Amino acid sequence: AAQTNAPWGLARISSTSPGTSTYYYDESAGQGSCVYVIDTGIEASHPEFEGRAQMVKTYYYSSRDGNGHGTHCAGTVGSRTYGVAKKTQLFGVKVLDDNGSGQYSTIIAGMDFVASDKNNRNCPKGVVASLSLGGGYSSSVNSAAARLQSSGVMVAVAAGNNNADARNYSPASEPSVCTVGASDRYDRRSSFSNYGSVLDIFGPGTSILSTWIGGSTRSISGTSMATPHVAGLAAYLMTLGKTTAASACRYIADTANKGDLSNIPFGTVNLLAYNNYQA
Fold this sequence. Notes:
It comes from Parengyodontium album. The chain is of the alpha/beta class. Helices cover 23% and strands 23% of the residues. It has helices spanning 8-12, 69-78, 104-117, 139-150, 223-239, 248-254; strands at 2-3, 23-24, 33-39, 53-58, 89-94, 126-131, 135-136, 153-158, 169-170, 178-183, 201-204, 208-212, 216-220, 257-258, 271-272.
């Protein structure tokens, strides 16, 4: 299939070159996969989710996304217009309050929740978790992300927006998950994007159009926005039987557009998420 006038990030992950506007993707579209969005929640009532989004857990007084961040990332994973995997199931896990902040303990609990909650769900093509969050290095947060991955979930996490090595940040520094840096529409590393050897892949992260609360849309920049691209791509590639949860990150790295990005510091992978779709 094709989506004309797609957000540049969707077009980018289906092309070998920047600057296009069409998103090319197999029509399966992540159908049968599930993506937990671990964030400020999801406004499941947004028409862009077409009833494929639902809240499954909150760690605050309300399940509703009073911030937008989570609804925005869920949109990039699998919304109709702004989503990589347009038929995937979205599950909201609200670990950040409406100010977007959340204790390390809360974020760890949310990751443990997903590891077991997935056994209650029907995701015959596999499970993905998208974690557009992070803070300073925490062994315990890292361990939680690793547990989620080993439990059978493809974990994608943001490298962080500090323009520094992601090794000093969690869960970005967990080696076993898929740490995602951000690029802009001109195939530059995003100005804010963390880097380092722990990074596994880059995704579109600068000025990313997606859903927003109040049934709205806006553009936001952040490695938090590159992460759902890769999570969506993983769900997409899993539905296609190209890869599994345990191998998706390395599969995406293997099939990525190589050496296209600029300002990638020595020691950081020069890899941009690419769905390799052929009509």
